[PDB]
Amino acid sequence: EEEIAALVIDNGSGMCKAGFAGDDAPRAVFPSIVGRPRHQGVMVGMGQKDSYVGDEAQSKRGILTLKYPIEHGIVTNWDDMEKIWHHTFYNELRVAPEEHPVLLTEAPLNPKANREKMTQIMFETFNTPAMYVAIQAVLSLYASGRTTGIVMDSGDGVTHTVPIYEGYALPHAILRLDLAGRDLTDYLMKILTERGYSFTTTAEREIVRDIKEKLCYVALDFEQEMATAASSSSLEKSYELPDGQVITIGNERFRCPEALFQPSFLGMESCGIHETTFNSIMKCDVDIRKDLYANTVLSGGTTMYPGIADRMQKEITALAPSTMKIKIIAPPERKYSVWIGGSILASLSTFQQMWISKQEYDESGPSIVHRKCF
Amino acid sequence: EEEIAALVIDNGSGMCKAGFAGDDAPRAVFPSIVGRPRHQGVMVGMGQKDSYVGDEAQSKRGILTLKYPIEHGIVTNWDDMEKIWHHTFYNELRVAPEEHPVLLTEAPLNPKANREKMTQIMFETFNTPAMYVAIQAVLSLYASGRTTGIVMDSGDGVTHTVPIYEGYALPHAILRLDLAGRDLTDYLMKILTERGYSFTTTAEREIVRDIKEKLCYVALDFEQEMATAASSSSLEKSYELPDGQVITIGNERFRCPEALFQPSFLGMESCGIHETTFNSIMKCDVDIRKDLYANTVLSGGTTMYPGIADRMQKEITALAPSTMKIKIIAPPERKYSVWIGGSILASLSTFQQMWISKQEYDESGPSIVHRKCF
Amino acid sequence: EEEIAALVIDNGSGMCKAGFAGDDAPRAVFPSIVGRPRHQGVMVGMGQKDSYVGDEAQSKRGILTLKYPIEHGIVTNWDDMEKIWHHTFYNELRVAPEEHPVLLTEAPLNPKANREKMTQIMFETFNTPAMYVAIQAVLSLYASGRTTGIVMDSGDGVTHTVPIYEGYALPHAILRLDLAGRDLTDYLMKILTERGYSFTTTAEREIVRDIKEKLCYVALDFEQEMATAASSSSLEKSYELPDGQVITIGNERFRCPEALFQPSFLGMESCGIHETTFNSIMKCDVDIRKDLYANTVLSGGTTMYPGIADRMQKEITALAPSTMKIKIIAPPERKYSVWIGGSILASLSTFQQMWISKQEYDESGPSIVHRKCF
Amino acid sequence: EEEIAALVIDNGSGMCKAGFAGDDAPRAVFPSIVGRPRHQGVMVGMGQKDSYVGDEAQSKRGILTLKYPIEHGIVTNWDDMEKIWHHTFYNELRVAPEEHPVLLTEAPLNPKANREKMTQIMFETFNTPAMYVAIQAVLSLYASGRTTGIVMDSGDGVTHTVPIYEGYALPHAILRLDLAGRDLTDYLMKILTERGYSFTTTAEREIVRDIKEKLCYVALDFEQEMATAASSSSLEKSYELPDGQVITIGNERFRCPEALFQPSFLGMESCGIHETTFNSIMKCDVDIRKDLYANTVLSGGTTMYPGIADRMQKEITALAPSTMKIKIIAPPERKYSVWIGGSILASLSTFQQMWISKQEYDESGPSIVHRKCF
Ligand SMILES: Nc1ncnc2c1ncn2[C@@H]1O[C@H](COP(=O)(O)OP(=O)(O)O)[C@@H](O)[C@H]1O
Ligand SMILES: Nc1ncnc2c1ncn2[C@@H]1O[C@H](COP(=O)(O)OP(=O)(O)O)[C@@H](O)[C@H]1O
Ligand SMILES: Nc1ncnc2c1ncn2[C@@H]1O[C@H](COP(=O)(O)OP(=O)(O)O)[C@@H](O)[C@H]1O
Ligand SMILES: Nc1ncnc2c1ncn2[C@@H]1O[C@H](COP(=O)(O)OP(=O)(O)O)[C@@H](O)[C@H]1O
Ligand SMILES: [Mg+2]
Ligand SMILES: [Mg+2]
Ligand SMILES: [Mg+2]
Ligand SMILES: [Mg+2]
């Protein structure tokens, strides 16, 4: 008589997005933090709570300590992590998770001690009829409507690439880097002490993160800008703190995003973001390199810096031979690319035969996810 | 009022040609390979097939393993071989094989365990009204319009000669060599590692084969060219890979085709291609040697190397006595010589009495081919 | 008045061994790496060097980047490679290379652009009175004191086989595979992320390599062990990192060495180590296959895994016909088999007439090595 | 208590037999082949010879090319042929040929350019005191102890008959055929490709020859056996190759020896072995035909096929008139019949006056053999 749908929860590491299948945008988006008070309080006639989750913690962050339940794509705290899902199902979507299947996302090359515990939580605490776990990068390709190209995923905790030629994925060419937005925010705080501003409290870290995504951009030619910025002052901008003071940042605007292409700034030795894509392609066969060069897809929040498309094209061209053409495909909605691909996949007619049923969990539940989602 | 035609299928070993009788060119030509995927695939919304046959496999050869159903003129796989014929009858010629007789070709000195199974397949699976099997080399003589001369057949798996004086064939002078294009391609890969290029995958073998038939030629004087090529550099050519890189080959241009005249390079002890023709002629009677010397006919794909006619004339002259004249007849269309001869033979007025009827198969079908085609 | 000896330098790809002729063991063994600092340093009163070569780099590897001058048996860097030889001649053997002939080793089927540059370095920079280059696998047979059998060489960069019947070698049966210890170490790092341990730095790669040669073994029956290891826990061992933490590895003990017999794990399509030996033997004549089956000789560092002799016998028996007996000869000192054979060869009375003299280099020096060592 | 031993060699074409006079069996028997290496060799510490003669070549035939110095009873190579005699005199009989007369055998109707060169070799290189040349077939009659009958000689290169009535020989009735064991071996290789086994190398020809003299027999009624062999399978036998594989031959057991009675199989037009004997007898006078019919003597290696005596009796009876009785005399030791007759002849008291002395050679040596041995 009625019909059902499927929830898509792109958990990620740093921001949680939830919604219903069939739509083109998430319904609820909120940062994933857990805060606790650190004082005693003197007032008696107040309904003082014990823990704040989600947007509420972002409001009263002057008297709390904020802790992130997920670090580098691997969840470390489970008591706090249970609270995040409990908030999403009840106070945001207002849907009881007992008749609607759930779909999750998870980064590649992670311990399968993680995927085991995800099965235990949702099949015991909430008792969902079905669930499935998919790679984040693969879902990004569904949004573009294409089945050929190498996808670059760069969220807040991890950065990985996976090539797909045509309906097949090569598992031996997957790479991974532990360099993402969290490392850039800590780097910006280190170099913002240059002008006399010092932020040390975890509450003040949120203020620094806001500056990063409001005034930073990637320079087309790094060396030329430093000469220009040193002489004149046309690149200086002013920002206003919540306290009322005004701060001005000069050459720091493009020094922070430049760390993506030169990881040597942070003290880590590794290839840049542009060189990782080149190495991934060269690990494929000789007849696939032509199509992959003409289809490169970007995704993730970190990629949203203005002018990042032009710089990536220049870097790849100098490395690849001059005969073929290099094209970077950067859709304007790349921030929600992962979530949209999840909605399309869960609505396919032929995908309904791949769910993990409640009956299957009864026999070898903690180990079924390894083989059925391989 | 309505007449039926006859299909000619020069199966060969390495390339299949099909067409209708009465024409001067085959209608469908495609390599005979069968490919299967070797990965798992992650995409759901794709019509992923299980096996690719013919030109389709040559397109997506970056994710497949290619296997040849025929090796050295003897078919080894029958499940894959059935697929090749099924593709030819339906998806290329678009004719139902239930009212048109079929004609095949087959190399001499092969096991008649082979010709038995060919009868079983076409008289049970497709139920053709009639069929006939003929020697490949004999059909080549019909195209030239002559009935006197020794024909040299050199395809991709076998190389054989058969002399015919006048309307009669001598069965005791037929020779055979297991040296053909497949051995040359493997030899080229072995010596192409000299300059740093290494091809090992079966998909990369197709790239090496393309180079062979685009840049190789036979030298008139082998020893003189090596002295010339070593000093100067006017014999160097450049080729472009599908990946975009450029490769240059020097003295390797004529080292590969030279293996035909000196089989000692490959580690096999045997006479060269030129010496085999001499030995075949000397096995005939004393009054036939004059006419055979003045009519030598070449055929097959391997013979298409430029400058092979001049070298063969020089080799034979040094062996035969100086009195008679040696002439090598190399028509410009020798690549399709076998097929054209099949079309003419099937259209003869007096050949219609030699078909193998469906009634004859009922009594001693698996054994009738031995006596009726003798 | 005095007498001369000959130095033997089994260069290999990954470890260098040097010594004097007539002995039974190398005098100096050290890894072949070159390291450079990646920081600036603040201390003034220190004798800070610019580059570290050999065992010194292995000590202070916490602040250096290690680079291998040789990859896959083909040297890529010559400035760094010159440093390795300079260290060996002076700081380890303490002998001036101006009166003692030198002997080298080199893998088969390599570009002879390589052997040309080896001649240039030793005849100009050091000016050695004589030198000679020999195949690695052939030298291994001298140590066994036998002249009949197929030798399997598996070092760190290459894996090749060459058959020798009796005093003669067949050059058309030599095979080669690009699968060696370096590929196994990278594979172990990929699957060691399963339990939460992540090594990414080139300095941390040396730690992973140490685990491989201290806790890994080859299982007699691969499928049976997985069933046993999954249920019980008697196959688990513990290892201690330099930092102090303890790590435990379960079924990963035998999953890494199993990649030798099934190259499909790494994404490469090729025959296993056992199947390559079978194909090499079948390329010989019909009367040689009996003696080669009864004499198989192993060598190289990779072959030192416990229990590899028993597994190889089982694999060959299933392929070869049951009549003959299969014997695998694995001497306990197979790690130094190549070097010992070099010492014996350089001490033979009849070998002194095959050196390349300084006079010969003056005429056609860069090209004499091709013909005199053929 | 003293005599001059005689060395008696029945050179033949395909096998050499040597021994001393007065014995009943040859002392040394070995195939007459000469082999040379066709590779280069890498080993230094080996006593590698340049040419192998006799039984040694039969051992290491996997790396050599075997050449027969004698073809069709006419020696073609003299440098190789000198080596065969040098081996026999020194390394097998261990007797210096300077005091013992030598006796040879030679087929009839051969060029007396041959017998001239035999005189030159033994009277210059070895300087034997005396020598004599005799017809092979005549010597066969001495072994039987009879002086009336027609002898059939069929070795490996030639087949000839000569009638002798009583103490006299008729020179105008001698016949000759170029059909012997060598033609049968080549025929067997041609029809053994029927079942999929292909032997092409000269080393593999020796394996085919071994099968011929171990599993072949002559059928009493050719047409009846084919009907029997086609229906049932009681005539199939299995043979084991040196490699270990097993092969089975069906009706090929008696198809090869049948070519002797029907030369039309090989493409040669001639009378059979049975018809040649009939034609030879009919060339004699009318009063001799009765005794010759009752005494037919066989000899040679080719005649050793089982059941050849019964078939020959049936063939002759149908041709000759029914009045007289036909008897075929086939002694069990017919393989050494020629040699034994040589031993008896050289020991006769009245034969010592027919030697060719060293003094006679000085005047007209190259021409004395024509008249003194007429
Ligand atoms: N406009 C922007 N410019 C730069 N960085 C941005 C921008 N918007 C978001 N980010 C970065 O995106 C990071 C999170 O990316 P996101 O894709 O939301 O993570 P996840 O993949 O876990 O959902 C933040 O930590 C922030 O630094
Ligand atoms: N232009 C060319 N130059 C050199 N070789 C060629 C050329 N065209 C075809 N060949 C060779 O001819 C072979 C094809 O022979 P084919 O006609 O298929 O014989 P068959 O039909 O008996 O199998 C291929 O293996 C290829 O190497
Ligand atoms: N005990 C061991 N167990 C497993 N592997 C080993 C052991 N000892 C050495 N190896 C492997 O052998 C390799 C060394 O090979 P080596 O003898 O240097 O070859 P080459 O001299 O040709 O370079 C190392 O990479 C290492 O992985
Ligand atoms: N048992 C046998 N069955 C069949 N053929 C045989 C047998 N023994 C020997 N032969 C044939 O006889 C030949 C040997 O003849 P041989 O006595 O050497 O003649 P000659 O001495 O004149 O050379 C061989 O080629 C072999 O084929
Ligand atoms: Mg994301
Ligand atoms: Mg052809
Ligand atoms: Mg080694
Ligand atoms: Mg004889």
In chain B, what are the domain boundaries? 7-36+50-137+336-372, 141-179+271-335, 181-260
CA distance A29 to A133: 20
Q: CA–CA separation, C157 vs C182, rounded Å?
A: 7
- Report in angstroms the alpha-carbon separations of D10 from B31, D32, D73, D105, D106: 60, 12, 12, 5, 8
Q: Are A71 and A13 in contact (CB under 8 A)?
A: yes
Within 13 Å and on the Cβ side, how many CA atoms surround C207?
Answer: 17
Q: What is the identity of the amino acid at C326? A: I
The answer to whether A57 touches A35, Cβ cutoff 8 Å, is yes
Q: What Cα–Cα distance (Å) separates residue B187 from each residue in B159, B182, B209, B253, B259? A: 17, 9, 11, 12, 9
Closest ligand to the CA of C12: 3
Question: Terminal CA-to-CA distance of chain A, rounded, Å?
Answer: 35
CA C317-C323-C329 angle, 5° bins: 50
Q: How far is CA D266 from CA B151, B171, B172, D301, in A?
A: 22, 9, 7, 20
Fold (topology level) of D141-179+271-335: Nucleotidyltransferase; domain 5 (3.30.420)
CATH code for the domain defined by B7-36+50-137+336-372: 3.30.420.40
Handedness of CA B344, B349, B353, B357 (dihedral sign): positive
Q: Phi first, then psi: what are they for A333, rounded to 5°?
A: -105, 30
Give the single-character DSSP code of A169.
B
Angle, in degrees to the nearest 10, between helices C202-215 and C181-192: 100
| Sheet strand arrangement including D149-154 | D175-177, D159-164, D149-154, D296-299, D328-329
Q: Please say whether the beta carbons of A297 and A149 come within 8 A.
A: yes
- Name the nearest CA neighbour of C55 among C79, C75, C29: C29
| Closest alpha carbon within chain B to A142 | B43
- Which of these, C190, C202, C208, C272, lies nearest to A173 by C-alpha position? C190
Query: Which tokens in the block code for residue A366?
Result: 């903690």
Q: Is the dihedral of CA B255, B258, B259, B264 positive or negative?
A: negative
Its sign, for the CA torsion D265, D266, D267, D271, is: negative
**CA trace torsion B142, B273, C279, D191 (10° rounding):** 60
A266 in helix, strand or coil?
helix
List the structure tokens of B73. Answer: 């003129």
Q: Are A285 and B203 in contact (CB under 8 A)?
A: yes
D39, D45, D241: residue with CB nearest C348: D45
Q: How many CB atoms lie within 10 A of CB A26?
A: 19
- CATH superfamily of the domain spanning C141-178+271-335: ATPase, nucleotide binding domain (3.30.420.40)
* Total residues found in chain C within this entry: 374
Residue B195 amino acid letter: R
Partners of residue C263 in chain B, C-beta under 8 Å: none
Identify whether the C-beta of residue A361 lies closer than 8 Å to the C-beta of residue A123: yes
In the numeric block, which tokens belong to residue B369?
């081919």
CB-CB contact of A283 with B239 (8 Å): no
* H or E segment to which residue D52 belongs: strand D52-53
The answer to whether residues D206 and B184 touch, using CB atoms and an 8 Å cutoff, is no
Give me the phi and psi of A167, to 5 degrees please: 60, 5
Looking at the DSSP assignment, which residues form a beta bridge with residue D101?
Answer: none
Contact status, residue D162 vs residue D150, Cβ threshold 8 Å? yes
According to DSSP, residue A354 is labeled S
Distance CA D33, CA B206 (A): 45
Cβ pair C32, C84 in contact under 8 A: yes
Residues 6+ apart with CB under 8 A from C76: C69, C70
Sequence-ordered alpha helix ranges (H) in chain D = 55-59, 79-87, 114-121, 136-144, 181-192, 202-215, 222-231, 252-255, 273-282, 289-293, 308-319, 337-346, 358-372
Q: Distance (Å, rounded) from C-alpha A315 to C-alpha A275?
A: 8
Q: Residue D101 in contact with residue D131, Cβ under 8 Å? A: yes
Here the tokens at position C31 are 């890894």
Find which of B38, B40, B44 to mutate to test the A interface (most A CBs within 10 Å of its CB): B44
CB A187 within 8 A of CB A223: no
- Cα separations (Å) of C304 from C96, C106, C135, C155, C334? 35, 21, 21, 11, 8
CB contact under 8 A, A285 and B245: no
Integer Cα distance of C211 and C207 in angstroms: 7
Across-strand partners of C134? C105
> Beta strand pairing status for D15-20 and D7-9?
antiparallel
Question: Across chain A, which distance is largest between two alpha carbons, in Å?
Answer: 76
Amino acid at A190: K
C184, burial (CB in 10 Å: exposed 0-12, middle 13-18, buried 19+): buried
A181-260 adopts what CATH topology?
Answer: Actin; Chain A, domain 4 (3.90.640)
**Cα gap B163→B161, rounded to integer Å:** 7
Contact of B204 with chain A, judged by CB distance below 8 Å, is answered with yes
Token pair, residue C226, equals 């997985």
d(CA A153, CA A180): 10
Q: E strands within C186-276?
A: 237-240, 246-249
C39-43 LR contacts (CB < 8 Å, sep 24+): C39/C63
Nearest to B43 among A147, A170, A285 (CB): A147
Rounded Cα gap, residues C198 and C213, in angstroms: 19
Q: Is there a shared CATH topology between the B7-36+50-137+336-372 domain and the B141-179+271-335 domain?
A: yes
* Ligand 4: centre distance to CA B47 (Å): 69
Whether C337 and C140 have beta carbons less than 8 Å apart is answered as yes
Which one-letter amino acid corresponds to residue B136? Q
Measured from the CB, is residue C336 less than 6 Å from ligand 3? no
Q: Is the dihedral of CA C141, C144, C148, C153 positive or negative?
A: negative
Torsion angles phi and psi, residue B123, rounded to 5: -95, -5
How does DSSP classify residue C304?
G
Q: Which residues contact B86 (CB under 8 A, 6 or more apart)?
A: none
Q: Is the C-alpha dihedral spanning B309, B312, B318, B323 positive or negative?
A: negative
How many of the other CB atoms lie within 10 Å of CB of B184? 21
Query: Distance between CA atoms of B112 and B114, rounded to whole angstroms?
Result: 5
CATH superfamily to which A7-37+48-136+337-372 belongs: ATPase, nucleotide binding domain (3.30.420.40)
**Interchain CB contact of B279 with C (< 8 Å):** no
Q: How far is the CA of A88 from the centre of ligand 4 (A)?
A: 97
CATH number of C7-36+47-136+338-372: 3.30.420.40
Virtual CA dihedral for D122, D124, D127, D129, nearest 10 degrees? 70
Rounded to 5°, the CA angle A185-A186-A192 comes to 85
Polymer length of chain A = 374
User: What CATH class does D7-36+50-136+338-372 carry?
Assistant: alpha beta
In this structure, what is the dihedral angle of CA atoms A99, A100, A102, A103, given to the nearest 10 degrees? 150
Please check whether residue A356 is in contact with residue A30, taking contact to mean a CB–CB distance below 8 angstroms.
no
d(CA C291, CA C326): 10
Q: What tokens appear for B236 in the block? A: 């160097």
CA distances from B270 to A283, B163, B178, B256, D57 (A): 43, 20, 10, 17, 20
B176 C-beta neighbours (distance < 10 Å), count: 20
Residue pair C29/C39 in contact by the 8 Å Cβ criterion:
no
Element (H, E) at D61: none
Asked if the C-beta of D194 comes within 8 angstroms of chain B's C-beta atoms, the answer is: yes
Answer whether A148's CB lies under 8 Å from A122's CB. Answer: no
State whether the beta carbon of C153 lies less than 6 angstroms from ligand 3. Answer: no
What pairing do the DSSP bridges indicate for beta strands C296-299 and C328-329? parallel
Q: Which method, experimentally, gave rise to this model?
A: cryo-EM
Which 3-state string (H, E, C) describes chain B? CCCCCCEEEECCCCEEEEEECCCCCCCEEEECCEEEECCCCCCCCCCCCCCEECHHHHHCCCCEEEECCEECCEECCCHHHHHHHHHHHHHHCCCCCCCCCEEEEECCCCCCCHHHHHHHHHHHHHCCCEEEEEEHHHHHHHHHCCCCEEEEEECCCCEEEEEECCCCECHHHCEEECCCHHHHHHHHHHHHHHHCCCCCCHHHHHHHHHHHHHHCCCCCCHHHHHHHHHHCCCCCEEEECCCCCEEEECCHHHHCHHHHCCHHHHCCCCCCHHHHHHHHHHCCCCCCHHHHHCCEEEECHHHHCCCHHHHHHHHHHHHCCCCCCCCEECCCCHHHHHHHHHHHHHCCHHHCCCCEEHHHHHHHHHHHHHHHCC
**Looking at residue D155, what DSSP letter applies?**
-
Which among A6, A15, A24, A18 has a CA at the least distance from the CA of A341? A24
Partners of A328 in beta bridges: A296
- CA closest to A75 among chain C residues: C196
Instruction: Dump the DSSP string for D299-338.
Output: ESGGGGSTTHHHHHHHHHHHHS-SSS---EE--TTGGGHH
Contact A269 C201 (CB under 8 A): yes
User: Does residue A269 belong to the interface with chain C, where contact is any CB pair within 8 Å?
Assistant: yes
Of the candidates B341, B321, B312, B283, which has an alpha carbon nearest to the alpha carbon of residue B147?
A: B341
Q: CA–CA separation, A18 vs A33, rounded Å?
A: 16
Show the tokens assigned to B328: 């090598």
Interface test with B, best of D61, D64, D193, D231 (most B CBs within 10 A): D193
Half-sphere exposure of C351 (CA within 13 A, CB side): 21
Cβ neighbors of B71 (< 8 A, separation 6 or more) are: B13, B157
| DSSP-based three-state secondary structure for D7 | strand
Strand partners, A132: A103
> Facing residues of B151 across strands?
B162, B297
Q: What are phi and psi of D165, to 5 degrees?
A: -80, -65
Sequence-distant (≥ 6) Cβ neighbours of residue C306 within 8 angstroms? C217, C218
Instruction: Decide if C69 contacts C80 (C-beta within 8 A).
Output: yes
- What are B103's strand-pairing partners? B8, B132
Q: Is the dihedral of CA C259, C265, C268, C272 positive or negative?
A: positive
Looking only at the bridges linking them, the beta strands covering D52-53 and D34-37 are antiparallel
User: Across the strands, what pairs with D357?
Assistant: D130
- Give the C-alpha separation, D256 to B43, whole Å: 64
B332 reaches A (C-beta below 8 A): no
Within 8 A of C347 by CB-CB distance, chain D residues are none
Which residue shows structure tokens 């490709």?
D193
How far apart are alpha carbons C212 and C216 in whole angstroms? 6
If you measure CA to CA, which chain A residue comes closest to C193? A111
Distance of CA B38 to the CA centre of its chain: 30
Mapped onto helix, strand or coil, the DSSP state of residue D19 is: strand
C-alpha D314/C-alpha A356 separation (Å) is: 86
Alpha-carbon dihedral angle through residues B91, B92, B94, B100, given to the nearest 10 degrees: -120
How large is the C-alpha radius of gyration of chain C?
22
Long-range contacts of D270-275 (CB under 8 A, 24+ apart): D270/D177, D270/D179, D272/D315, D273/D152, D273/D154, D273/D159, D273/D177, D273/D179, D273/D312, D274/D312, D274/D315, D274/D316, D274/D319, D275/D319
Mutate to test the interface with B, among A144, A165, A168, A353 (most CBs of B within 10 A): A168
What type of residue is D203? Answer: A
Q: Considering only CA atoms, which of B155, B104, B109, B108 is closest in space to residue B298?
A: B155
- Which of C10, C15, C71 has the most ligand 3 atoms within 8 A of CB, as the residue to mutate? C15
Residue B322 burial (10 A CB sphere; 0-12, 13-18, 19+): exposed
Residue with tokens 């950067």: A330
Give Cα separations from A365 to A362, A372, C250 (angstroms).
6, 11, 21
Q: Which two tokens stand for residue C120?
A: 């240039």
Cross-strand bridge partners of residue B249: B237
